[PDB]
């Protein structure tokens, strides 16, 4: 129902480091002069975090902190609120501000965004956290008038409201798109599944499949495509009966092979539309364990009937685009086969 | 499922700059025989007869005009068993001969292209304008006469060219223009988005409701939208119209004036299944001797009970870029949309879709 952007000279890449804490990494310049983080792009958040100087916790003054005081654009926003955000493996807190971002080779101004002064309710402490670019709606915003994805639209006229993301961890070359896709990154169609609530990327799902069994769906279910998560979830009440069909098995670097080709097959349903995840798919290895990637979350507002597909996953697996709407268009998830490495 | 937009050489998609005479006449070029006899016809979705006026007419109305005399084309070709064309519709009628002639559009050149010569054209509207032609853009099945329709046949003869086109409408600038073969990314922001054509005789899509401000006009019956580049004017049917005029009356206006009057009309939102567009007062308003106007006009389309809705050039296409891309088989052609680019003054590259 829409029309991807591929022209070569209007789609910028972003390339995302996958670091051995299980973090897909890109470059963000903040402040003038500008200093380089390292943030994790969220489809699964909107808020824009920053970690600061501001910080002088174990696990900030281990990273490449960005020093506001050193950037001739930084502006204390709100100045006398905190904003604490707590999730299921840490907390984050911090002030508000506006800075100046430079993303590939597009700039934006006045952007508002967070400045992390604590992580302190810890997850935060077995990886080096360097900030969040949220890719959600603007709804999402825990603080500020402009999501940084509508803004940088709104300052670079020629972007269309476009992003995907690849994932390739094997060869380290997972990137990051601004503008529409590449052939370079997926094979066959796209096929489009709107949004039915602009707060998180949330499409319609009609049902999933584990081999013969359906685990869903017997009421109105959604899914949630979370590049924030390397996990797919599902409900707390639906859990306990997927590790019952997926269960974990002791595998090998040479015996994962074989353990694997009796697992079942775990199908997707969007409608008439059926996306399929292997064994080899959706199973990891994990100290000579084949443990199903997959995690328990309660999305609060979709009463317990949000799944979620995160990077290793699927989007591993299946190529991604996101299509932002303006006022009157709808906004849409594309998946694709995803062009795979080696 | 999805179209891509990509980037192609700046030669599968040629330019017809469309001038916006004085008449409300959008009319580009084209070179009819050899040696070439040039007219300046309009390009019309809603038919896809091609029609030539030519010197077989020798009415008041066609003297006006730079005729096309066939008797001077040596590549014009009357078949030996000739057919009459005669067509009627709401401001006049044409009538005509057919034959068969090279066309040069864009410089792309199609040979055997039936046409139909214009010869009569008393009903009339005619009078108000300096009509040379028609390229007909609608499907084959609404050839009144051929077996090819112009734009068929002009791919089928050019492996170059995409079956797309698309049109710009900017007559204050005077870039207004007819792209064939794909889009250009300089005349439309933001995303383009797809309608699927229900039946292909006019570009005809679904339409799921039709507001003025608040007031829901449409639709209690399934009803329909057809992108007619032959009227500048949206259409409605009559028994919706009465009550458009009704809520959207026409006042006094003038080229300073018209911010402020019509800084309280309502707005027209078109709803498409998952997709709004909506229209401003000073978008479907225009100025006509000291009044505005809505560019609106009562059109029944008869094979669609009146339930179809036209959107034309100045009420919709002037602030939507329009695609037209035509499908084979199992693919359905489809509409394109998306929000028209007032800054646009060139077509610096091009491309085309899936
Ligand atoms: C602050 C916004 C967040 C976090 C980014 C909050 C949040 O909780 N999530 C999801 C999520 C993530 C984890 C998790 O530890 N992720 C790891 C992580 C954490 C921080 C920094 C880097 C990394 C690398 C990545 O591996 C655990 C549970 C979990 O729950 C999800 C599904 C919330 O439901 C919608 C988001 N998408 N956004
Ligand atoms: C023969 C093909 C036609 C005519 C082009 C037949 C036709 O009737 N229409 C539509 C239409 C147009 C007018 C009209 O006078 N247009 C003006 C005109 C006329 C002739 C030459 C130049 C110009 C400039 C333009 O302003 C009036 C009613 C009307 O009804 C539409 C909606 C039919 O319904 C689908 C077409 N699309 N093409
Ligand atoms: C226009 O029509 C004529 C006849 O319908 C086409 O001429 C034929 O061309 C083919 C292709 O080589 C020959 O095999 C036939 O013998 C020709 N028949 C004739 C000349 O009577 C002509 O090709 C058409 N023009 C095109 C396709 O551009
Ligand atoms: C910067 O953004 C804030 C956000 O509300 C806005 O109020 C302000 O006007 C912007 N700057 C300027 C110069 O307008």
Redesign the pocket.
Request: net charge negative; charged share 5%; glycine share 14%.
């Given at each position: 129902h829409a029309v991807v952007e591929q022209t070569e000279e209007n789609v910028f890449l972003i390339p995302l480091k996958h670091l051995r804490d299980?973090?897909f990494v890109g470059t963000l310049l903040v402040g003038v002069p500008p200093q380089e983080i390292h943030p994790?792009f969220?489809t699964?958040?909107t808020?824009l975090?920053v970690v600061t100087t501001d910080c002088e916790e174990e696990s900030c003054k281990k990273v490449k902190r960005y020093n506001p005081y050193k950037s001739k654009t930084f502006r204390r926003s709100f100045i006398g609120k905190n904003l604490h955000?707590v999730?299921?493996?840490?907390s984050?807190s911090g002030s508000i501000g506006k800075e100046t971002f430079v993303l590939g080779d597009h700039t934006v101004r006045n952007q508002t965004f967070g400045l992390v002064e604590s992580e302190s309710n810890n997850?935060?402490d077995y990886?080096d956290?360097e900030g969040?670019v949220g890719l959600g709606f603007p709804e999402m915003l825990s603080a500020g008038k402009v999501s940084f994805f509508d803004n940088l639209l709104s300052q670079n006229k020629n972007l269309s409201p476009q992003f995907s993301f690849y994932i390739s961890p094997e060869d380290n070359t997972s990137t990051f798109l601004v503008g529409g896709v590449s052939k370079s990154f997926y094979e066959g169609s796209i096929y489009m599944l709107p949004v039915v609530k602009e707060y998180?990327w949330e499409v319609e799902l009609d049902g999933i499949y584990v081999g013969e069994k359906k685990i869903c769906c017997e009421e109105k279910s959604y899914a949630?495509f979370?590049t924030?998560?390397?996990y797919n979830?599902m409900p707390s009440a639906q859990m306990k009966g997927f590790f019952d069909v997926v269960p974990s098995a002791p595998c090998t670097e040479e015996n994962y092979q074989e353990v694997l080709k009796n697992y079942p097959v775990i199908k997707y349903l969007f409608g008439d539309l059926v996306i399929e995840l292997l064994p080899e798919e959706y199973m990891i290895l994990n100290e000579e364990s084949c443990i199903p990637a997959y995690?328990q979350?309660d999305?609060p507002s979709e009463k317990n009937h949000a799944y979620?597909l995160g990077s290793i996953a699927f989007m591993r697996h299946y190529y991604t685009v996101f299509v932002r709407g303006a006022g009157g268009q709808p906004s849409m998830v594309g998946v694709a086969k995803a062009r795979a490495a080696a």
């Open positions: 299980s973090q994790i969220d699964g958040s808020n975090w955000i999730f299921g493996s840490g984050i997850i935060f990886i956290f969040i998180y949630i979370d924030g998560t390397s979830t995690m979350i999305v979620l």
